[PDB]
Amino acid sequence: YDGTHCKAPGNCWEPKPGYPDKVAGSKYDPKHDPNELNKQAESIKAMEARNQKRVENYAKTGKFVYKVEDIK
Amino acid sequence: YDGTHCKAPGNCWEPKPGYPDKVAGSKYDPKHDPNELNKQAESIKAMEARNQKRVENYAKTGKFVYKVEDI
Amino acid sequence: NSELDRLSKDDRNWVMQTKDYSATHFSRLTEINSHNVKNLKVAWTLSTGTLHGHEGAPLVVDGIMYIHTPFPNNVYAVDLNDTRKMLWQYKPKQNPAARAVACCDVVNRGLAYVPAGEHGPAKIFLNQLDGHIVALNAKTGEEIWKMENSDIAMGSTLTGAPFVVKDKVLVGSAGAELGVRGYVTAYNIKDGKQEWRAYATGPDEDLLLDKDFNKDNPHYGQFGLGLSTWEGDAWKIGGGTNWGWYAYDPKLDMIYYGSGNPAPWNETMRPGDNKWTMTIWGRDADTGRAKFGYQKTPHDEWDYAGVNYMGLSEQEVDGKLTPLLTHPDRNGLVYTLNRETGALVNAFKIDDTVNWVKKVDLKTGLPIRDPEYSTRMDHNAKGICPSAMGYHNQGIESYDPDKKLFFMGVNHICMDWEPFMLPYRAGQFFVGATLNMYPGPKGMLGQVKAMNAVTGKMEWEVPEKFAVWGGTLATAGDLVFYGTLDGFIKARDTRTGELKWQFQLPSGVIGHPITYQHNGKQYIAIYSGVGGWPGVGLVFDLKDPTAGLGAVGAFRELAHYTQMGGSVFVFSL
Amino acid sequence: NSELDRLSKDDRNWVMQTKDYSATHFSRLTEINSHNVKNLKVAWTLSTGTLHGHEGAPLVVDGIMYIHTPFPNNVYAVDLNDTRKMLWQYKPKQNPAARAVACCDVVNRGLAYVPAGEHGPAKIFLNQLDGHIVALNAKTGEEIWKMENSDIAMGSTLTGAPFVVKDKVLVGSAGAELGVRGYVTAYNIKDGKQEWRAYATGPDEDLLLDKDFNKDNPHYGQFGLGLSTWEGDAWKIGGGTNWGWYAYDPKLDMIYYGSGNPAPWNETMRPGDNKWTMTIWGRDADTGRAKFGYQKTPHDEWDYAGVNYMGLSEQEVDGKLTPLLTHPDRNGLVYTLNRETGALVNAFKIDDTVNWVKKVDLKTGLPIRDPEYSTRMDHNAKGICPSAMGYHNQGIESYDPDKKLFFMGVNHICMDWEPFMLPYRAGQFFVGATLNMYPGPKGMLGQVKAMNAVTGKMEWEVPEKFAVWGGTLATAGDLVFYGTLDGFIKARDTRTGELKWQFQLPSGVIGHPITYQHNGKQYIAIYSGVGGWPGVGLVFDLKDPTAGLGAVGAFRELAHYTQMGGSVFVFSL
Ligand SMILES: O=C(O)c1cc(C(=O)O)c2c(n1)C(=O)C(=O)c1cc(C(=O)O)[nH]c1-2
Ligand SMILES: O=C(O)c1cc(C(=O)O)c2c(n1)C(=O)C(=O)c1cc(C(=O)O)[nH]c1-2
Ligand SMILES: [Ca+2]
Ligand SMILES: [Ca+2]
């Protein structure tokens, strides 16, 4: 693996000698919980929702409020 | 109470107008707990006793040790 | 922001961390020069009131200095006509749990500023460790608005400074050591309203690409790679945070910055090129759409986080004057690109001892890897240069346009590295490697170098006892200024590298110096307060040489010279 | 210690916090003087690594500076030939709970030193907040011995500097706000073996009185008074701790120091003169037995803790040269006594606004009280001068023997005071009074004054924005140096009080300046790091004006000028 042999433009990864092409079902299967993987994006949507609630409130009233439970 | 009238040399305290000579049994009784008053003295006795073991050890062995349970 | 740009041309001001949109860190002020700098003395000082690492540096706009602080990121304004009095202050209430999800000390790289204002009054911007981007009144300190960008529950914080472009403020990201998937966000300065948000990995719409993405260099790779260079949903926790610096070309109307390392450090757990981690970005300002993107380190095996600063300049490439960006990466290579097309102009080793790559093929753009210095499961790679701290880290460097030289503070640190298997859990560290660090082959930990970025020609090179971490400041007085980890500020002649002045500060320096003129006299200012990654051993009282992600052993002797501190020093003739 | 005395008398050394056994704080060095102090600049600096208040000042012996620190009381040694490197360090492990039983910030007033002699290597002595006295190897920083003096479980801590006399080191006490009965202890420096211990209250055997105690002034009082001036067992928890400074006359072989305030602050709970709190002691060195004892403030009602410095001088009293001690008490009076007989020579107001006392009757030695400014239960007393912080506090002041003048940093604070009933509990606070403070009748919070201690003649007086808390240093260059709470070091002409120099330190100052000659050059050094009683508001972030024992209100504005810090500053030409 010298990084030179590319299967496509921008894609030149190869396994090292003695290592699998796919890690799924192998020695080094990362075995990730899908539920844990999805928590980041779920958290960001929550923030963007609270953020939009703060913006629209700031726009209508003209006074900024951070605490969304204090927003009508 | 102006600090000038003295029962005896070095003793010039007087109550202020409307205040008692002794506070025992008065409105301003401190009502101190004898056991609490004794705690400093006992604590100090323990410190001096631990320190003594540290010194006697240090004089005997020539090597200092703080923790008395290792002495 | 044209008015911000105009304000930066006033030598009374220092309006952004990078000094100006080209991040030159160069002042034309010549009152202080190689000829009289020996007479430089402390003029006045301020305590920040906190400890730990003090990165970035003050801002100066309208004869008013603005000071920031590591966690809890306190902010103070000072009237330069009364340096003793605090004009205003802002003291954030943050969940102290944020401390626990910071890999490398609770550093913060400082304030941003925007003048008034159809949006309206002038504003100071602060990224808090807890993930908030906050807007303050530049004059009164009143909180104007405050938004949630990053969630510490997910191991996601902020450390990189906000960046003002037009009527928008860009907020980066941090926490690739905790498997945080990178993203940069643009907020409207008036509202705090999210305009656009671009991720470092995943589907093309999340990358926020332009239809002509890399049309000038299609061999860089174009579409689908945010998915296809990963196995399965590996990209959802695949790093690429950007906690470094930005650059901006108003004519091209483009933002430049680099994305960070993939997660985890265990390369065997994420086969593939891992795009678009470790990528130099050129995004359109209004839409956030990438016009080009170049991956420096495909399938990272060393944590060479591609977040270092972006230095713009205009120099000749084969006789043709060309808009450029120069960018010294953690991997020990200095990249220069055409900042319009993204075309690779040069990529040279900042120090010849770099050994993870033999060379970069400028035609293919690919770094030719030396398998002998790779990392992999069930193997302990030895003698890798650079280490994960890189031959260059978060310091902003400087450029003299008349000499056409970049002046940089360099690290000389190498490592041993062995990965291990580990699970991912939101909120937990997700590193997966054990490191040991030590000086490079030349025996020293630090260097200072002057170089032409197009040719790679080193004009001079000097050693430093410790890695030079905080960046540099260059002036037309033929001087370059910088702080050292063992607690000096130093001035060298930019022609020769000769040491011409040094002062013993209270604590080590991990930020850059600034300069400005106030009431007709030139001043030099700097933060003193050691910390950051090189100081984790000192700061958190660590003993194990592999603790602090391997940094502890390398910087064991640092505590022989400096304690923690927190102050602003100001010098003048 | 005759060797320690000799060392104190050449100007390459600063061997004790008080400089010498007479606490002159006066230097013969003249390189720096009123005519060139204009050009004084910062030579080098050090960070202490901690925040909170920095009282006391470094020591300099045999080319080594010795640095100390607030909790956890870290010690550092620095070679003056290599000011960047730390020669050695001592980092105490203490119970964090010790913080909780300190009344007025976790301050510490410094190291003491003994030369090698028969005991034998040279030693550094440290009092820790947690009530330990520690002896360290002066050259290596190795721990030689360690003893328990005070128990934090009882609210008993240590904040005053150790004091070396002959082959003994004296350790004081602290915690009268927590009902601690005061006592001073002498430890053998070879062994750490307790030689003697004297209490401030109770039976005469516990007080350690000489059979001829107060024979020269029996009207002061003599025997039995440690019990009979209390009601029942109230003496068992009656204050009198000594956390201030000492003085020593080798010719008379006598130690001088003042015991502190009685407990509680609620005067109604402890009727009687409360001897021997608030007392100027003159004790025999070897046996600890008192030759004289003068109670300055019988039955204290204001917390005028009588622990301030003793300054020894020799001046003419009615034409005859007399051995004296001069002593600026918290009660706003400046006491001058014959330091052999204990006879009262004069006792003048340090500022004429002092109102708790009309005047001291010099022939009877009694302070004639003004009942209008007393305190008592079910009354809120208004407009008492001085407040509990006093018109003078823990600063060590200076004396020019040529000019026969003392130079003092003065406070101008006054208070409201109402007591309230409260139980005593070991380990809990035992104050029992609510206070509110404000500036005195003259609008300022602070003053600097030069005075003749025998006549009482004020030579000059200048205002200061805040209380001058850290003490002073005078030199034969006609200069007096001091630090201010808002964060300056200043120099004034000693003949006139004219301001000659001023430098803005990072943080406020609560300790004294020192000066010393190293390698033919004169230096000035000082701590910068605000705290102590005046700083409790900004240090612990308090808002209630009566909090911090009534300090928070009067010093609300302090935070407008200074944050916490921790550093050493060294000046030179
Ligand atoms: O992946 C990340 O999110 C992330 C964040 C940070 C940070 O927040 O400072 C650093 C790094 N990585 C990193 O790799 C690194 O070497 C580093 C050094 C420092 C510092 O304080 O000087 N921060 C960081
Ligand atoms: O009686 C005591 O036990 C005691 C201790 C201390 C101390 O520990 O510093 C102070 C006081 N009292 C006191 O009355 C006082 O005004 C004071 C000021 C300070 C300071 O550091 O600024 N400490 C103390
Ligand atoms: Ca990283
Ligand atoms: Ca007290």
Coordinates of C-alpha atoms in Angstrom, one line a residue, chain D residues 22-418:
Chain D
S22 CA 14.4 44.5 63.7
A23 CA 12.0 44.4 60.7
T24 CA 13.5 47.6 59.3
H25 CA 12.7 46.6 55.7
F26 CA 15.4 49.2 54.9
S27 CA 18.2 48.8 52.4
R28 CA 21.5 50.6 52.1
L29 CA 21.6 49.9 48.4
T30 CA 21.6 53.2 46.4
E31 CA 22.1 52.1 42.7
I32 CA 18.4 52.7 42.4
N33 CA 17.4 56.1 43.7
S34 CA 14.9 59.0 43.5
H35 CA 16.8 60.6 40.6
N36 CA 16.9 57.5 38.3
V37 CA 14.0 55.3 39.4
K38 CA 12.3 56.9 36.3
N39 CA 14.2 54.4 34.2
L40 CA 13.4 51.2 36.2
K41 CA 12.3 48.4 33.9
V42 CA 11.2 44.7 34.2
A43 CA 14.2 42.4 34.1
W44 CA 12.5 39.0 34.3
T45 CA 9.4 37.3 35.6
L46 CA 8.2 34.0 37.0
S47 CA 4.7 32.4 37.2
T48 CA 3.8 30.8 40.5
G49 CA 1.4 28.3 39.0
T50 CA -1.4 29.3 41.3
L51 CA -4.1 31.9 41.8
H52 CA -5.6 33.5 45.0
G53 CA -3.7 35.9 47.2
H54 CA 0.1 36.2 47.2
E55 CA 1.3 37.6 50.6
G56 CA 4.8 37.7 51.9
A57 CA 7.7 37.9 49.4
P58 CA 10.6 35.8 48.1
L59 CA 13.8 35.2 50.1
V60 CA 17.3 35.5 48.6
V61 CA 20.2 33.7 50.3
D62 CA 23.6 32.8 48.7
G63 CA 22.5 33.5 45.2
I64 CA 19.2 31.6 45.4
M65 CA 15.7 33.1 45.4
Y66 CA 13.0 31.1 47.2
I67 CA 9.4 31.3 46.1
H68 CA 6.2 30.4 47.9
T69 CA 2.5 30.1 47.1
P70 CA -1.0 30.1 48.5
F71 CA -2.8 26.8 49.0
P72 CA -1.4 24.2 48.4
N73 CA 1.7 26.2 49.4
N74 CA 4.1 25.1 46.7
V75 CA 7.8 26.1 47.2
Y76 CA 10.3 26.8 44.4
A77 CA 14.0 27.6 44.4
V78 CA 15.6 29.6 41.6
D79 CA 19.2 30.1 40.8
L80 CA 19.8 33.8 40.2
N81 CA 22.4 32.9 37.5
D82 CA 19.7 31.0 35.6
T83 CA 16.3 32.6 36.2
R84 CA 14.4 30.4 33.8
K85 CA 15.2 27.1 35.4
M86 CA 13.8 25.9 38.6
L87 CA 16.5 24.5 40.9
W88 CA 14.0 22.5 43.0
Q89 CA 10.4 22.3 44.1
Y90 CA 8.2 21.0 47.0
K91 CA 4.6 20.3 46.2
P92 CA 2.7 19.6 49.5
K93 CA -0.2 17.2 49.5
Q94 CA -2.9 18.7 51.8
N95 CA -6.5 18.0 52.6
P96 CA -8.6 20.2 50.4
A97 CA -11.0 20.7 53.4
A98 CA -8.3 23.1 54.8
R99 CA -9.7 25.7 52.3
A100 CA -13.0 25.6 54.0
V101 CA -11.7 26.7 57.4
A102 CA -9.7 29.7 56.2
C103 CA -11.6 32.9 57.1
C104 CA -10.1 35.4 54.6
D105 CA -8.6 33.6 51.5
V106 CA -6.1 30.8 51.5
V107 CA -3.1 33.1 51.8
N108 CA 0.4 32.3 53.2
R109 CA 2.9 34.8 54.4
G110 CA 6.1 33.1 53.5
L111 CA 9.3 31.0 54.0
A112 CA 11.9 31.4 56.7
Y113 CA 15.5 30.4 56.5
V114 CA 18.3 29.2 58.7
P115 CA 22.0 28.7 57.8
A116 CA 23.8 25.5 58.3
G117 CA 25.3 25.4 61.7
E118 CA 25.2 22.5 64.1
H119 CA 21.8 21.1 63.2
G120 CA 23.0 21.1 60.4
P121 CA 22.5 21.7 56.8
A122 CA 20.8 25.0 55.8
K123 CA 17.1 24.8 55.8
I124 CA 13.9 26.4 54.4
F125 CA 10.9 26.4 56.7
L126 CA 7.3 26.4 55.5
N127 CA 4.0 26.7 57.4
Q128 CA 1.2 24.9 55.5
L129 CA -2.5 25.9 55.6
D130 CA -3.3 22.5 57.0
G131 CA -1.4 23.2 60.2
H132 CA 2.0 21.5 59.5
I133 CA 5.4 23.1 60.0
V134 CA 7.9 21.6 57.5
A135 CA 11.7 21.8 57.4
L136 CA 13.3 21.6 53.9
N137 CA 16.8 21.2 52.7
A138 CA 17.7 24.7 51.5
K139 CA 19.9 23.4 48.6
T140 CA 18.0 20.3 47.5
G141 CA 14.5 20.8 48.6
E142 CA 14.5 17.5 50.4
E143 CA 12.0 17.1 53.3
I144 CA 13.9 16.8 56.5
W145 CA 11.1 16.8 59.1
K146 CA 7.4 17.6 59.4
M147 CA 5.3 18.2 62.5
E148 CA 1.6 18.7 63.3
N149 CA 1.0 22.2 64.9
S150 CA -2.6 22.9 64.2
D151 CA -5.7 20.8 63.5
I152 CA -8.0 21.9 60.7
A153 CA -10.8 19.7 62.2
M154 CA -10.9 22.4 64.9
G155 CA -10.9 25.3 62.4
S156 CA -7.3 25.7 63.3
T157 CA -4.9 26.6 60.4
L158 CA -1.6 28.3 59.6
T159 CA -1.1 31.5 57.5
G160 CA 1.8 33.3 59.3
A161 CA 5.4 32.9 58.3
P162 CA 7.7 30.8 60.5
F163 CA 10.4 32.7 62.5
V164 CA 13.9 31.5 63.2
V165 CA 15.6 32.4 66.5
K166 CA 18.8 30.7 67.6
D167 CA 18.3 27.0 67.0
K168 CA 14.5 27.2 67.2
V169 CA 11.8 28.0 64.7
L170 CA 8.6 29.7 65.9
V171 CA 5.2 28.7 64.6
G172 CA 2.1 30.8 65.3
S173 CA -1.6 30.0 64.9
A174 CA -4.8 31.0 63.1
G175 CA -8.6 30.6 63.4
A176 CA -10.0 33.0 66.0
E177 CA -13.0 33.3 63.7
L178 CA -13.5 29.6 64.4
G179 CA -13.1 29.8 68.1
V180 CA -9.4 28.7 68.2
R181 CA -7.5 29.5 71.4
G182 CA -4.2 31.0 70.3
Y183 CA -0.8 29.6 70.9
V184 CA 2.8 30.1 69.7
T185 CA 5.2 27.1 69.6
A186 CA 9.0 26.8 69.4
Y187 CA 10.4 23.8 67.6
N188 CA 14.0 22.7 67.7
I189 CA 15.3 23.0 64.1
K190 CA 17.5 19.9 64.2
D191 CA 14.8 17.6 65.4
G192 CA 11.3 19.3 65.2
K193 CA 11.0 18.7 68.9
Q194 CA 8.7 21.0 70.7
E195 CA 10.7 23.2 73.1
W196 CA 7.9 25.3 74.5
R197 CA 4.3 26.4 73.8
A198 CA 2.6 29.5 75.1
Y199 CA -1.2 30.2 75.0
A200 CA -2.9 33.6 74.8
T201 CA -5.6 32.8 77.3
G202 CA -6.2 30.6 80.4
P203 CA -4.1 29.7 83.5
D204 CA -0.7 31.4 83.9
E205 CA 1.2 28.1 83.4
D206 CA -0.3 27.9 79.9
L207 CA 0.6 31.5 79.2
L208 CA 4.2 30.9 80.1
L209 CA 4.8 33.9 82.4
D210 CA 8.2 34.8 84.0
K211 CA 8.1 35.2 87.7
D212 CA 8.9 38.9 87.1
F213 CA 6.2 39.3 84.4
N214 CA 5.3 43.0 84.0
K215 CA 7.4 44.0 87.0
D216 CA 8.2 47.4 85.3
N217 CA 4.5 48.0 84.7
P218 CA 2.4 46.1 87.2
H219 CA -0.5 48.4 86.3
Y220 CA -0.7 46.5 83.0
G221 CA -1.9 43.6 85.1
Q222 CA 0.1 40.5 86.0
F223 CA -1.1 37.1 87.3
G224 CA -4.4 35.3 87.1
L225 CA -5.8 37.6 84.4
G226 CA -6.0 34.9 81.7
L227 CA -8.8 33.4 83.7
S228 CA -10.3 36.2 85.8
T229 CA -10.9 38.5 82.9
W230 CA -13.2 35.8 81.4
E231 CA -16.4 34.3 82.7
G232 CA -16.2 30.6 83.4
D233 CA -14.7 28.5 80.6
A234 CA -15.1 31.0 77.8
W235 CA -11.3 31.3 77.6
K236 CA -11.1 27.8 76.3
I237 CA -12.3 29.0 72.9
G238 CA -11.2 32.7 73.2
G239 CA -9.1 33.6 70.2
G240 CA -5.7 35.3 70.6
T241 CA -4.2 33.5 67.6
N242 CA -1.0 34.9 66.2
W243 CA -0.6 34.9 62.5
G244 CA 1.4 38.1 62.1
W245 CA 5.1 38.9 62.4
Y246 CA 7.8 38.7 65.0
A247 CA 10.8 40.7 66.0
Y248 CA 14.0 39.8 67.9
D249 CA 16.6 41.6 70.1
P250 CA 19.7 39.4 70.4
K251 CA 21.2 41.6 73.1
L252 CA 18.1 41.2 75.3
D253 CA 17.4 37.7 73.9
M254 CA 13.7 38.6 73.5
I255 CA 11.0 37.8 70.9
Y256 CA 8.2 40.3 70.2
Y257 CA 4.8 39.6 68.6
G258 CA 1.1 40.4 69.1
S259 CA -1.7 38.0 69.9
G260 CA -5.0 38.4 68.0
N261 CA -8.7 39.0 68.6
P262 CA -10.9 37.2 71.1
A263 CA -13.8 35.0 70.0
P264 CA -16.5 35.3 69.2
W265 CA -16.9 38.7 67.5
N266 CA -20.1 39.0 69.5
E267 CA -18.7 40.9 72.5
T268 CA -21.8 40.3 74.6
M269 CA -21.0 36.6 74.7
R270 CA -17.6 37.1 76.4
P271 CA -17.7 39.8 79.2
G272 CA -14.4 40.8 80.6
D273 CA -11.1 42.2 79.4
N274 CA -10.4 38.8 77.7
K275 CA -6.7 38.8 78.5
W276 CA -4.4 38.0 77.0
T277 CA -5.9 38.6 73.6
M278 CA -4.7 41.8 71.7
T279 CA -1.4 41.9 73.5
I280 CA 2.1 43.1 72.7
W281 CA 4.4 40.3 74.0
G282 CA 8.0 40.4 75.0
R283 CA 9.2 36.8 75.6
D284 CA 12.5 35.1 76.6
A285 CA 14.0 33.3 73.6
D286 CA 15.0 30.0 75.1
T287 CA 12.2 29.5 77.6
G288 CA 9.3 31.4 75.9
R289 CA 8.5 33.1 79.2
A290 CA 7.0 36.6 79.0
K291 CA 8.9 39.5 80.6
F292 CA 6.1 42.0 79.7
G293 CA 2.7 42.0 78.1
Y294 CA 0.6 45.0 77.2
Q295 CA -3.0 44.5 76.2
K296 CA -3.8 47.2 73.5
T297 CA -7.5 46.5 73.2
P298 CA -9.2 45.2 76.3
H299 CA -12.5 43.4 75.7
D300 CA -12.3 43.8 71.9
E301 CA -15.6 44.7 70.1
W302 CA -14.3 45.3 66.6
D303 CA -11.9 42.5 65.7
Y304 CA -8.9 44.7 65.9
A305 CA -6.6 41.6 65.8
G306 CA -3.4 42.8 67.4
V307 CA -1.0 40.8 65.2
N308 CA 0.6 43.5 63.1
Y309 CA 4.4 43.9 62.6
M310 CA 6.9 45.0 65.2
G311 CA 9.6 47.5 64.0
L312 CA 12.6 47.8 66.3
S313 CA 14.5 51.1 66.4
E314 CA 16.7 53.2 68.7
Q315 CA 15.6 56.8 69.3
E316 CA 15.9 59.5 71.9
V317 CA 13.1 59.6 74.4
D318 CA 13.5 62.8 76.4
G319 CA 17.1 63.2 75.3
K320 CA 18.0 59.6 76.2
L321 CA 18.7 57.0 73.5
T322 CA 16.1 54.2 74.1
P323 CA 15.6 50.7 72.6
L324 CA 12.1 50.7 71.1
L325 CA 9.4 48.7 69.3
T326 CA 7.0 50.5 67.1
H327 CA 3.7 48.8 66.3
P328 CA 0.8 50.0 64.1
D329 CA -2.2 48.1 65.5
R330 CA -5.4 47.4 63.7
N331 CA -7.2 49.7 66.1
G332 CA -5.7 52.7 64.4
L333 CA -3.1 53.5 67.1
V334 CA 0.6 53.4 66.6
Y335 CA 2.3 52.0 69.7
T336 CA 5.8 52.8 70.7
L337 CA 7.2 50.9 73.7
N338 CA 10.5 50.5 75.5
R339 CA 11.4 47.1 74.2
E340 CA 13.3 46.2 77.4
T341 CA 10.9 47.3 80.1
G342 CA 7.7 47.3 78.1
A343 CA 7.0 50.8 79.3
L344 CA 4.6 52.8 77.0
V345 CA 6.3 55.7 75.3
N346 CA 3.6 57.0 73.0
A347 CA 0.4 55.8 71.3
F348 CA -1.0 58.1 68.6
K349 CA -3.8 57.8 66.1
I350 CA -2.4 56.9 62.6
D351 CA -5.3 58.9 61.3
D352 CA -7.4 61.4 63.3
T353 CA -10.7 59.9 62.3
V354 CA -10.3 57.0 64.7
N355 CA -13.3 57.2 67.0
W356 CA -13.7 54.0 69.0
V357 CA -11.2 55.5 71.4
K358 CA -10.8 59.1 72.5
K359 CA -7.2 58.7 73.4
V360 CA -4.8 56.4 75.2
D361 CA -3.8 57.6 78.7
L362 CA -0.1 57.1 78.6
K363 CA 0.4 57.0 82.3
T364 CA -2.2 54.3 82.9
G365 CA -1.8 52.7 79.5
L366 CA -5.6 52.5 79.1
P367 CA -7.5 53.4 76.0
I368 CA -10.4 55.7 77.0
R369 CA -13.4 54.3 75.2
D370 CA -16.1 56.3 73.4
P371 CA -19.3 54.4 74.1
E372 CA -21.0 55.9 71.0
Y373 CA -18.8 53.7 68.8
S374 CA -18.9 50.5 70.8
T375 CA -20.7 47.3 69.7
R376 CA -23.3 45.2 71.6
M377 CA -26.2 42.8 71.1
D378 CA -29.5 44.2 69.8
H379 CA -27.8 47.2 68.5
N380 CA -26.4 48.0 65.0
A381 CA -23.5 50.3 65.6
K382 CA -22.9 52.8 62.8
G383 CA -19.8 54.7 61.6
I384 CA -17.1 53.0 63.6
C385 CA -13.5 53.9 62.6
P386 CA -11.5 51.8 62.0
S387 CA -13.5 48.8 60.7
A388 CA -12.5 45.3 61.5
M389 CA -10.0 45.4 58.6
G390 CA -8.3 48.2 60.6
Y391 CA -6.5 51.3 59.6
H392 CA -3.5 49.0 59.3
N393 CA -3.3 45.2 58.6
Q394 CA -0.7 42.5 57.8
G395 CA 1.8 44.6 55.8
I396 CA 5.4 44.8 57.1
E397 CA 6.4 48.4 57.0
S398 CA 9.7 50.2 56.8
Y399 CA 12.1 52.5 58.7
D400 CA 14.7 55.0 57.6
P401 CA 17.2 55.3 60.5
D402 CA 18.8 58.4 59.1
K403 CA 15.4 60.2 58.7
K404 CA 14.0 58.6 61.9
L405 CA 10.8 58.0 59.9
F406 CA 8.5 55.0 59.5
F407 CA 6.7 54.6 56.1
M408 CA 3.4 52.8 56.2
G409 CA 0.6 51.6 53.9
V410 CA -2.6 52.7 55.6
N411 CA -6.3 51.7 55.3
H412 CA -9.2 54.2 55.4
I413 CA -12.2 51.9 56.1
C414 CA -15.1 52.2 58.5
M415 CA -18.1 49.9 59.4
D416 CA -21.5 49.1 60.6
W417 CA -21.6 46.2 63.1
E418 CA -24.3 44.2 64.8

